[PDB]
Amino acid sequence: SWGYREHNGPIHWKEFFPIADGDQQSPIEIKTKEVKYDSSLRPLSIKYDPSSAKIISNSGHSFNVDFDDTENKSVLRGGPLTGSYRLRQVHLHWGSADDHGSEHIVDGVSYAAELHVVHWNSDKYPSFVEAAHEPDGLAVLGVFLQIGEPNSQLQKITDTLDSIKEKGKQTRFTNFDLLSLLPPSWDYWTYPGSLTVPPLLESVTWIVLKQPINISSQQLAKFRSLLCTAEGEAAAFLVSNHRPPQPLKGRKVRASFH
Numbered sequence: 001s002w003g004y005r006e007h008n009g010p011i012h013w014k015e016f017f018p019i020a021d022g023d024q025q026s027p028i029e030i031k032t033k034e035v036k037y038d039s040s041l042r043p044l045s046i047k048y049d050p051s052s053a054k055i056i057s058n059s060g061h062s063f064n065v066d067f068d069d070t071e072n073k074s075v076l077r078g079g080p081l082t083g084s085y086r087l088r089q090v091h092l093h094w095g096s097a098d099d100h101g102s103e104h105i106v107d108g109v110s111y112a113a114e115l116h117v118v119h120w121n122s123d124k125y126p127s128f129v130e131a132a133h134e135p136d137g138l139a140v141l142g143v144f145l146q147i148g149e150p151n152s153q154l155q156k157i158t159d160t161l162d163s164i165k166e167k168g169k170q171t172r173f174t175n176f177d178l179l180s181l182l183p184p185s186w187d188y189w190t191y192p193g194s195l196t197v198p199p200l201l202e203s204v205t206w207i208v209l210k211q212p213i214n215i216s217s218q219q220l221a222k223f224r225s226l227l228c229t230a231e232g233e234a235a236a237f238l239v240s241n242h243r244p245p246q247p248l249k250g251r252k253v254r255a256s257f258h
């Protein structure tokens, strides 16, 4: 099955998910001189209820914090979006060194990690599953992490990691103030793209925040101790789980700021 090791990692994904070589794949190199300022873009309109988070789990490919998406308590609107996108999922990508962990890369700068916040269009689709298959279905907010001061909200997550070391393990996790985790500036770039993991669907409006948030090197390194293997199977660690940048193929990357 797909992963990030030699035999199953990103260069091999196309073997099983041919859309891996499609025309709207993510992540991308963000080249600031090539981005177009677009005054029609709106500020982000962000509403995240800390009681929405319910469960943290090891998928084998990241941790996922799962939110109750029963109704519209936590929604992202504005930015480049038409309509309201409901909070589903948060997860993180990193690498084996603090030097190079993010998925989007900004004029050659890879950050230590990248947080993705996944939302779905409940104004047009009845469920996350239906939305994940359509071009306007998903919106993912990307937030870079750089090494700096320990992050008190991320410490809540690192504290759970011992309990979800094995693939498939979950534990209850709530009261996660996602809104306060975001950087002080919400200026962003946006472009049409895809999920960065299989099935790689071209369903995502990406919103990548320019300003990183910090994490300590100690906190970040606790993520690499997750296993990508389930209880009772040869142990292998999830030391790195970022996909390389993909060709832009004529897509417009827009900035909400100049």
Ligand SMILES: CCCSc1c(F)c(F)c(S(N)(=O)=O)c(F)c1F
Binding pocket: 089, 091, 116, 117, 118, 132, 138, 140, 194, 195, 196, 197, 199, 204
């Ligand atoms: C139909 C499957 C969707 S679950 C999922 C996702 F929706 C993402 F956007 C991402 S991401 N990295 O594109 O934001 C992700 F990693 C996921 F696991």
